[PDB]
Amino acid sequence: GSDLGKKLLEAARAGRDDEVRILMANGADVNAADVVGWTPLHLAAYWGHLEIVEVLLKNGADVNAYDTLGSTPLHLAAHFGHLEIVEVLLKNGADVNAKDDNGITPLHLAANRGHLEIVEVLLKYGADVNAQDKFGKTAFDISINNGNEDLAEILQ
Amino acid sequence: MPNFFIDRPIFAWVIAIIIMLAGGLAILKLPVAQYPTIAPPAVTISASYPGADAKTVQDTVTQVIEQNMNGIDNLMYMSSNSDSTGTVQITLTFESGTDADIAQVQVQNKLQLAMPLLPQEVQQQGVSVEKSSSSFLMVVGVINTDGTMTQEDISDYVAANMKDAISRTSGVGDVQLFGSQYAMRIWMNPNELNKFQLTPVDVITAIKAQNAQVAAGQLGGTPPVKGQQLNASIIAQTRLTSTEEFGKILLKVNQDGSRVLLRDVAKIELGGENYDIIAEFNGQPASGLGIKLATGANALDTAAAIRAELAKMEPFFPSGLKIVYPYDTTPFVKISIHEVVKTLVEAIILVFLVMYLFLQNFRATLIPTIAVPVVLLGTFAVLAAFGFSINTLTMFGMVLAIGLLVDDAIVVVENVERVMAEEGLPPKEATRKSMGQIQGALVGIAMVLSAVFVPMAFFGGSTGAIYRQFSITIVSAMALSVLVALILTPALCATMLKPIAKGDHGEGKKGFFGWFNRMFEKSTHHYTDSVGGILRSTGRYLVLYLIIVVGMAYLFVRLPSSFLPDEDQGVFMTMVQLPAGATQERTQKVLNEVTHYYLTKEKNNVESVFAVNGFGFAGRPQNTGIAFVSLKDWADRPGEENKVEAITMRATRAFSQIKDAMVFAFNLPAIVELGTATGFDFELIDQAGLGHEKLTQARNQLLAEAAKHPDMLTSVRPNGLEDTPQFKIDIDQEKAQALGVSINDINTTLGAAWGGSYVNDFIDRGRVKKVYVMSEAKYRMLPDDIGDWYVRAADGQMVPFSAFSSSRWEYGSPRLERYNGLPSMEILGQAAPGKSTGEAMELMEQLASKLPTGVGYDWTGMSYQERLSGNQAPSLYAISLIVVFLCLAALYESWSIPFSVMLVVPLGVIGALLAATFRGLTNDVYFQVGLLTTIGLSAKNAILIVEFAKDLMDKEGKGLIEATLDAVRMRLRPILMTSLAFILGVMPLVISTGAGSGAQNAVGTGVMGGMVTATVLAIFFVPVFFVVVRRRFS
Amino acid sequence: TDADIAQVQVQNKLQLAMPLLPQEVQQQGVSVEKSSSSFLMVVGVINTDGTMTQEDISDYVAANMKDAISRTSGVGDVQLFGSQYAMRIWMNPNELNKFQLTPVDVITAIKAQNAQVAAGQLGGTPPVKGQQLNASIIAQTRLT
Amino acid sequence: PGADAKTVQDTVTQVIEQNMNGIDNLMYMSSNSDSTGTVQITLTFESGTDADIAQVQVQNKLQLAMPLLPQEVQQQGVSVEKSSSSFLMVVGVINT
Amino acid sequence: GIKLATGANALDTAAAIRAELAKMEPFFPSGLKIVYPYDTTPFVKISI
Amino acid sequence: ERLSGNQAPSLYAISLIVVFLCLAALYESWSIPFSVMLVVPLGVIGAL
């Protein structure tokens, strides 16, 4: 928990591109985290800040870093419908089949909120469509329960 | 009327006696307080949802109450907060002049009908509707020195053995308990509950059954069998009254025969209702009582009565319990009265000296000494009739009026002494002629000063409420002074004053008085020669007049505006703000370090530190705290270095070193119920259901644009809290239904354990108190502890919480704000150095129009006050100027001549602005009322000069310059006498550095500086004004 | 007669009756109002583009306009010429009978699965010694 | 209903009485709690006091106490109204 | 349908409603518009 | 009854002082008031 590391977390969250650029030059800790275990990349992915995700990855940010409940930035990017960030993370070697503590993959989260374009991107980068969570429910089981005709057709 | 009371001096004495008795009666009965009701009537609806998050509170309580706040009279705006402490505060602010009782009952009544719409848990806790606009008289702190009692133990004793007796004390309006009475705390254990196959549901069911009142009936009750002898009430199960009884509550009976009790699966003790607040007084555990003054009550008597009743409780206290007084306003109000009584007595003493210095006889000096107290006494009687209280505003209203009261006495007596000297008439005949010259002017002056001061009362809101206190006080004091000057003083002059020989100006005497008379007579000849020279070349002084008017306008823009001066009240605050998501323990360590500083570094100044952890006026999360620092007496802290302002700056610079804690010390405002009332209060509104996130993005967009204008805006902060990580858990319905676990049992087990649950009441030593069931700390700290909780299914098997739930981290609001029913985010800020509030507010409106679609705004608090108060100002200034002109026009019988009087205004104002700028004070209300009294007395001096000058031209048929020179010759002595007395009178108020010095400095500096210029300039310039105006308009 | 006191006296007596009333009547919200029988004005609202139906316009008036008008000083009563939206569960008796269910089971399910739970906090007061984490627990919320 | 005088005094009467503080023009406050369960707290005000404003101020202070009362007391409903001790007349009714 | 509160002024209340409606108009959806098909206050204002 | 008895002396006091000042005002004298107001005891003993 460094001085610059705490400022990078707040900067990445707010989306101040100019401040993040300055903190990367001063050597702010990219692997710094809060109490729940969220990196600047987690926060940047959550609030949908495309530039800061790109800047952090170039400065050796952990793409497959996970919080205290095992959620990676790809989960947050896929769940909250950030198509651009999901592509950038997967290009920089993001684990597409990353399981959290509950066995919920990014495909499950993208399926639940009905983000059709993100499901196609995840499936392209090799998302396990038959991947089950702790309750034994696939991305298809989520689509039929939510009543999504378009999503159910794609997950064939 | 003057001629009537000269022949009837006893009837004049009767009117004087009636006024003195009415005044003396008023002084005994008049209410006493620090400040009157200034803030507008506010009604805060407070409710509690134990273990509820901000959104749960908003979406089940806040929105439901808000929707039912209709058909309520004189509602200006409605603002509410919903935070993760499980609390809601809905404040409805009402129009100034609205009945607060009618306002409260209408809000109360509409809430009562909405109670069935709220959740059962909220209905059980209940909802409180209180007046939040009032403030505390004193805060009585209760501590434990021997360390035998916790803050919970002290709070219970105060609730049981003190609070009620303090409430019944004479003049006590309201008593708030700083803490809570005991609660029966069942600290549940998930390991023990799972061992005997039980849940928090089983604990709640058992407590409700085995702790309750049961209705029975009567033996031989009506209708009876004829021949019944005995009739008696049947007593059944009453509520439990001890931890031992709660321990023996039977939960389950096993096959073997062993009894599973409540003490076998939980720790049972008397604790607090809520554990959010940790209050400490110099390290020791502490509680307290916030006491508010009742309506029409005496603050001095109430405080003495509170201390008297606390003394009676001394023998009954446990060992080590002591009473302390961290906050008490009564000492301040005690000094406020003593200093004002001193000023009024010193003012009368200075008049006695100056009257004897010039007139040189004891009989003359007694006439003002009688007349001034008669007017001051009468003023209290008129204030009593209007229903006003003796407060800081009304008391300084008297002090500012001294200049006008003193002049009325000197002007009347001095003119009689002059007429006797010049013409050689006896006292009675001399007074008839003397009063004949001024009686018309004195009535004219009354109407002019009325037109100046009366329109000040008709300002709107909190500003107008303060201006109303000075207006009614000064107008009443001035009005009685004119009546006393026409009724009493003429009678006193005719009866008491001795005759003076013709052409006797005390030049024949020797010693000091002989020298003074010869010196002043030649000084008068030097003055007349000087004015003669000025009137030959008037054009040069009209240029010098414009330089003063330009100099006045320049200093008006330069001098920065404020509301009231911050006072050393022997108390100040130190806020502690840790990063978001920080725990209670981390905040305590910073407060302990802050408490350590004040007791080490400022041991000579600081008396005590009231460290209130987990407390804040804009939400009460664990990360925020506050420390109420109480100082020693004013005598024990000499010099400017040992004052609150000096200690504030030293403290703030010291705590800036500390990491992971934003810590600032700051002084209280003048009117503590109102606040600073300097900057602006902005509301950003969600007008089209955008949501929390989009309103946050819009707020960040406005704050970013605000930062790009340091030249206009500065100190722009949001009043709200930022979003924080929260533990989202999703209960799988299919898995719960499959295993046979009901959703009620799941949501109760989670809610009761982690959040807490108010089950029912119990009687502790003849007092009803709450029974809470909650998990012991160690079993509800981390996400891993979720799996340790088991819920029984229908088939009897114990299912772990992990089996049918999934959890993740997300961001959400720990405090959701709403304004006028819609979601909002309150933004603070103030105008940059040089720029006015008007310009700063105008830019915020411009920046607001460029925010995303469906994002509106509104002004609240003092911004709402000033916008409605600002529009009224031009009209009141206009009415004042027009009526003053009309009154002077009627007096002189001329449209042109009035301008000669009204041109004096800048001569008094320029000096006040120079004195304020030099000493480095602000354009506050004390200064603004100070200008009117300076303008009033300077205008009064000019009126008598023009009246004398005009009457010589009309009656005695003298020329313009001859009359003007003869006029200012006659009026030189009384203008110097009043000025010499009044400048010396307000001199102590300038140099004062003690208690209430800020107000005294604001009153003194502006008046002294203004009176020096008003006296020195006007004696030369009023001649010029009259001759230039008379020449121009024939 | 002072209408302010008349309202207070009338409602003081209504509060004695309120608990004796049926639970369905209490939850509909009983209202005490002091106003003229006749209308001061009718504020009509239409859509010129014809994008919104009669039901859509009524909902907007009820959700965005009605409350602020009802709170305005001098407004004794506000009648909505329409209805605010509500979640309408239009039940089918044939389909309910097929799966062996009743309206009672539907109402029980809605109360259970459309719930706003008070779930407490991680690191809540009173906490253990050396607690670092403090966060609100969020369980079930109202369906949107 | 059902509670004795002592229980009723502790759970109701003292809870209301302690919140009846600093009301305008209050001369004295008499009250009694009985075996049947009834409470009656009479607040007598100064001569010339507006009885309607007095009623409002009492009602405002009661609703602070109301939440601290038991549920059974809230279910019966607590009345706040102007009162007098003596009867104007007694109208009797008989059957001939 | 707005009914006047007992004792309140017709013109002042009508002015207060128009002022509150004016705050809402900017934030309407496209097409939505206020119309005044019944008002008793204009007669009182014009007749005086 | 207690209140009636406690405020009776001050009621007599102010009542006497007002009548004295009213006589002093009307007749422009101190002697005439003092001459008149000495009669009060002569009446009061008759009532007792």
Ligand SMILES: CO[C@H]1/C=C/O[C@@]2(C)Oc3c(C)c(O)c4c(c3C2=O)C2=NC3(CCN(CC(C)C)CC3)NC2=C(NC(=O)/C(C)=C/C=C/[C@H](C)[C@H](O)[C@@H](C)[C@@H](O)[C@@H](C)[C@H](OC(C)=O)[C@@H]1C)C4=O
């Ligand atoms: C450095 O700028 C900040 C200082 C912080 O330090 C503290 C310790 O000094 C303060 C001083 C001296 C204050 O008078 C207030 C607060 C603070 C601080 O917190 C408040 N604190 C909060 C409660 C806590 N949160 C903080 C959270 C986001 C971390 C919000 C602010 N509310 C606060 C207030 N009342 C209100 O909300 C409202 C409705 C009242 C009136 C508003 C006017 C416009 C302001 O009063 C204005 C005259 C000025 O005081 C502020 C612009 C102040 O800037 C100064 C000193 O010029 C900033 C607040 C205050 O009156």
Ligand SMILES: CO[C@H]1/C=C/O[C@@]2(C)Oc3c(C)c(O)c4c(c3C2=O)C2=NC3(CCN(CC(C)C)CC3)NC2=C(NC(=O)/C(C)=C\C=C\[C@H](C)[C@H](O)[C@@H](C)[C@@H](O)[C@@H](C)[C@H](OC(C)=O)[C@@H]1C)C4=O
């Ligand atoms: C020592 O207590 C005073 C501090 C003064 O010193 C100052 C200079 O430091 C402050 C600090 C450090 C603050 O954090 C705040 C304020 C002030 C001060 O002013 C506020 N100032 C105001 C803003 C202006 N309005 C009036 C307006 C209509 C002109 C009220 C005051 N509220 C304020 C806040 N913001 C809010 O959240 C709002 C908008 C509501 C708050 C609700 C509270 C719970 C209630 O209103 C009421 C029960 C009481 O708590 C206050 C009135 C309290 O007074 C007393 C007697 O206790 C003052 C906070 C603050 O958070």
Ligand SMILES: CCCCCCCCCCCCCCCCCCCC(=O)O[C@H](COC(=O)CCCCCCCCCCCCCC)COP(=O)(O)OCCN
């Ligand atoms: C919102 C802000 C507040 C609003 C205020 C509005 C003010 C209304 C306008 C009134 C302005 C009055 C100010 C000028 C007064 C000058 C009086 C002097 C008159 C004068 O020259 O007469 C001489 C002196 O008179 C005397 O001095 C005594 C004799 C005259 C008595 C009659 C004067 C009028 C009464 C004053 C009050 C008027 C306003 C009442 C609402 C000669 O005396 P003489 O030979 O005339 O004496 C025999 C009587 N017959």
Ligand SMILES: CCCCCCCCCCCCCCCCCCCC(=O)O[C@H](COC(=O)CCCCCCCCCCCCCC)COP(=O)(O)OCCN
């Ligand atoms: C419940 C609370 C109560 C609190 C207490 C309040 C008390 C009420 C007020 C009491 C007022 C009493 C005042 C009496 C004054 C006595 C005057 C002595 C002289 C006297 O009586 O002899 C006359 C001489 O007066 C003269 O001719 C000289 C007159 C000039 C001098 C005037 C001085 C007045 C002093 C005022 C005192 C102020 C007191 C303040 C409270 C006789 O001659 P005559 O005049 O009768 O007949 C004229 C010839 N034909």
Ligand SMILES: CCCCCCCCCCCCO[C@@H]1O[C@H](CO)[C@@H](O[C@H]2O[C@H](CO)[C@@H](O)[C@H](O)[C@H]2O)[C@H](O)[C@H]1O
């Ligand atoms: C803070 C603002 C700065 C302070 C300003 C102070 C202004 C008030 C001071 C007035 C002093 C008057 O002083 C007076 O001036 C006039 C000049 O007009 C002199 O008059 C002299 O010059 C004039 C020129 O026209 C001749 O007609 C006259 O015969 C001659 O004596 C007087 O001899 C002197 O006594």
Ligand SMILES: CCCCCCCCCC(=O)OC[C@H](CO)OC(=O)CCCCCCCCC
């Ligand atoms: C003899 C003519 C004097 C008339 C002056 C009347 C002005 C006061 C009007 C009023 O009622 O407002 C009082 C107001 C309340 O804040 O007090 C004030 O702010 C004092 C007035 C400021 C000085 C005015 C002269 C300078 C002009 C540029």
Ligand SMILES: CCCCCCCC
């Ligand atoms: C202890 C002083 C009481 C009187 C206050 C009024 C004095 C001007």
Ligand SMILES: CCCCCCCC
């Ligand atoms: C100076 C303000 C009044 C103006 C009207 C009188 C004109 C002679």
Ligand SMILES: CCCCCC
């Ligand atoms: C109101 C002033 C008018 C004067 C014209 C001679």
Ligand SMILES: CCCCCC
């Ligand atoms: C008690 C009345 C006495 C009056 C004497 C002047």
